[PDB]
Amino acid sequence: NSNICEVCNKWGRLFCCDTCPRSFHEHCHIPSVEANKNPWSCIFCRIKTIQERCPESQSGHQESEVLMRQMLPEEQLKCEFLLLKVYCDSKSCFFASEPYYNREGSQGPQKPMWLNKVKTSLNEQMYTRVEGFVQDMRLIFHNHKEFYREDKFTRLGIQVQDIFEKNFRNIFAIQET
């Protein structure tokens, strides 16, 4: 197995996948690494198995159909994996914890949103459709771009949103256009 966490790229107390070489800090994996389980397979492996069991799941889909899906276990897992792929980018640090807004010439967003809040909402089964999760993720970046205006720091939101959108299209097999 790898000697660093797949998500944050640091060493520490690591839990090793039994079916691939990846390793994870307990709370960097999503869902958090399960207490007792041998063998244990990581979320990458679990997502791959869904693909293998149903190869046609990789055929192109319409975004509007994906968003309307209820959060059954496979969709729950795909949203957990999509969230994890955002945390895998080191620029996710800017979006992880609860933000605050005090900048001359700007007003904070009406509905603040951040990755750890989305992580909690998934863990608590608060989303009934894919749409709820995707709307909260897009809101994180939209709030950032509106607040920072012409400050070049706006670009961090564009960059992390692009990682989110590329992973969304791949994980949910959105039809290429």
Ligand X SMILES: CO[C@]1(C)Oc2ccc(N)cc2O[C@@]1(C)OC
Residues that bind ligand X (CB under 6 A): 44, 47-48, 85, 167, 170-171
Output 149 or 166, the one with its CB closest to ligand X.
166
Q: How far is the CB of 82 from ligand X (least distance, A)?
A: 8
Output 9 or 128, the one with its CB closest to Zn ion.
9
Q: How far is the CB of 154 from ligand X (least distance, A)?
A: 24
Of 171, 177, 176, nearest to 57 by C-alpha is 171
Q: How far is the CB of 19 from ligand X (least distance, A)?
A: 13
List the single partner that 48 binds among ligand X, Zn ion, none, CB under 5 to 8 Å by kind.
Answer: ligand X
Q: How far is the CB of 172 from ligand X (least distance, A)?
A: 9
Kindly state the tokens that stand for 11.
Answer: 């060493």
List the single partner that 140 binds among Zn ion, ligand X, none, CB under 5 to 8 Å by kind.
Answer: none
List the single partner that 7 binds among ligand X, Zn ion, none, CB under 5 to 8 Å by kind.
Answer: Zn ion
Count of CA atoms in the C-beta half-sphere (13 A) of 19: 13
Q: What pairs with residue 155 in β-bridges? A: none
Output 12 or 60, the one with its CB closest to Zn ion.
12
Cβ count near 9 (within 10 Å): 11
DSSP string of 2-62?
A: -SS-TTT---SS-EE-SSSS-EE-TTTSSSPPPSS-SS---HHHHHHHHHHH-GGGGS-B-
